[PDB]
Design a protein around this ligand. Structure first.
Ligand code: SIA
Length: 502
């Protein structure tokens, strides 16, 4: 029938790759090919024919056939040897290649990979592609099931900073990026050691640093170690204060909806005075926000609070701010937003007036005229499934809803904003998944302050895409730090605005 009964039906499945790439990167997958079964014992060779346009050929320095017993999602070097593979060189002018079945040694997964040269142009049109045209065993072709085209966009930088398996952690989630005044880059993450689930699972906070603008990164270091279920840590947000100290804020303990006034999920801060090399022991500041030890009786029966992961905002006055999403009642799964802020470099903390009813993870950015813009995640598919916005003209103390900023879809995800100037026009860059209604196709949009209108989205990384954080580098490049894949890797991408929009 569909399944015949005259022998073993070998089936070949073939995926083109669409992850970003950057110049001078080695062994980047263009196409992956999987056999459903091992080559049979009587088989002597497998031959793979492929096409590759001249514009791609002009941008690579070498080609390879990689053979592995594992089927990997990312480029094989991204797994740092945790995926063992053999590498068989191909001349860049060649369009076929063959391997003995002994060389293949029972393995089923084949990768057409390339070394990328020192490319000069990064426009939207500059993408690498290849196609596998033939797979034959003992000179007999097999039917190829093609499941996606190859299209790898060239970016000025592109690096997976945290990949499932790294350091023994099974998974990673929740990206936070910070550029300090001296130019250092701090990237932090949930080290989701056993699986991808949120607190109250056992989770660590891990960090990597770069002192050359993201060209190279230090070995990952665990900053805060989880100590078991209900005793992990995660959801980091970062700022640098006016005095120059770095500050991280994070939660730990039970899950968000399990937190109670008397047994809370706690909020901690830790600071660094040396550009992220060393960090102070985490200090519990839960008592400034809610619960049993809170000095405000009106908030002592609040149940939960957490600041949105990524970055806060330090205002021109030196006021340090993070938006907290707070659970006020145990009868409902509903959060309200309040700005958590300090006017004494983190010694004490206060709460603004309520900024958003039925909000979720929220971010802040500084308007050109000095007002503060809040972007609030739409949780629970409220209203028109749009992202929510609010404005404050008193440095974050009081707020009004700002529907004139609404206009982009939010499938219910954390994202980030940057205030940017383009062609003399003040604008806000906003990162979110495009969806629709799913965490797919990581996108950026530009909102024009003066016309009150949003651009069409530009997809930065197609495929599964979730939380993102953004920072401006000293030289005008943008650093974009996104959750890629269903099993997430945290990826740091660098571009200028013209690379995406004009
Ligand atoms: C402290 C905490 O629970 N943070 C988590 C939040 C909240 O659950 C929602 O924002 C509440 O609505 O969202 C995630 O689950 C998500 O949506 O990927 C991941 C993140 O770790």
């Amino acid at each position: 029938h569909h399944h015949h009964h005259h022998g073993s039906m070998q089936e070949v499945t073939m995926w083109g790759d669409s992850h970003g790439v950057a110049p001078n990167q080695v062994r980047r997958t263009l196409v992956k090919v999987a056999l459903s079964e091992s080559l049979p014992p009587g088989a002597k060779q497998i031959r793979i024919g492929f096409s590759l346009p001249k514009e791609t050929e002009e941008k690579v320095t070498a080609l390879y056939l990689l053979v592995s017993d594992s089927l990997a999602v990312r480029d094989l070097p991204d797994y740092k040897g945790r995926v063992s593979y053999d590498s068989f060189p191909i001349s860049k002018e060649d369009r076929t290649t063959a391997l003995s079945a002994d060389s293949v040694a029972g393995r089923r997964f084949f990768y057409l990979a390339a070394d990328i040269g020192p490319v000069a142009s990064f426009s939207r049109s500059d993408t690498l592609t290849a196609r596998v045209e033939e797979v034959a065993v003992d000179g007999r072709p097999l039917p190829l099931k093609e499941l996606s085209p190859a299209s790898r966009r060239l970016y000025r930088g592109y690096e997976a900073l945290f990949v499932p398996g790294d350091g023994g952690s099974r998974n990673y989630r929740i990206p936070a990026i910070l550029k300090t005044a001296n130019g250092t880059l701090i990237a932090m993450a949930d080290r989701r050691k056993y699986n991808q689930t949120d607190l109250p699972e056992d989770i660590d906070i891990v960090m990597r640093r770069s002192t050359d603008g993201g060209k190279s990164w230090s070995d990952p270091r665990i900053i805060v170690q989880g100590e078991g279920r209900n005793h992990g840590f995660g959801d980091v947000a970062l700022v640098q204060t006016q005095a120059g100290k770095l500050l991280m804020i994070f939660v730990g303990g039970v899950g968000l909806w399990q937190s109670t006034p008397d047994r809370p999920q706690r909020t901690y801060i830790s600071e660094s005075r040396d550009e992220g090399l060393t960090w102070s022991p985490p200090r519990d500041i839960t008592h400034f926000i809610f619960g049993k030890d809170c000095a405000d009786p009106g908030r002592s029966r609040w149940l939960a609070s957490f600041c949105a992961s990524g970055q806060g905002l330090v205002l021109p006055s030196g006021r340090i701010t993070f938006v907290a999403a707070i659970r006020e009642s145990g009868q409902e799964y509903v959060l309200n937003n309040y700005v958590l802020y300090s006017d004494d470099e983190g010694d004490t903390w206060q709460l603004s007036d309520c900024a958003y009813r039925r909000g979720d993870e929220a971010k802040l950015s500084l308007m050109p005229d000095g007002r503060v813009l809040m972007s609030i995640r739409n949780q629970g598919r409220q209203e028109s499934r749009q992202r929510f916005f609010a404005l404050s003209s008193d440095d974050g103390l009081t707020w009004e809803r700002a529907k004139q900023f609404e206009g982009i879809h939010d499938p219910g995800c954390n994202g980030a904003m940057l205030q940017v100037k383009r062609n003399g026009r003040d604008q806000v860059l906003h990162s979110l998944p495009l969806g629709p209604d799913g965490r797919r196709d990581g996108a950026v949009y530009l909102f024009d302050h003066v016309s009150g209108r949003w651009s069409a989205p530009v997809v930065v990384n197609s495929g599964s895409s979730a939380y993102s954080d953004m920072t401006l580098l000293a030289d005008g490049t943008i650093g974009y730090f996104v959750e890629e894949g269903d099993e997430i890797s945290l990826v740091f991408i660098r571009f200028v605005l013209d690379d995406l929009f004009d």
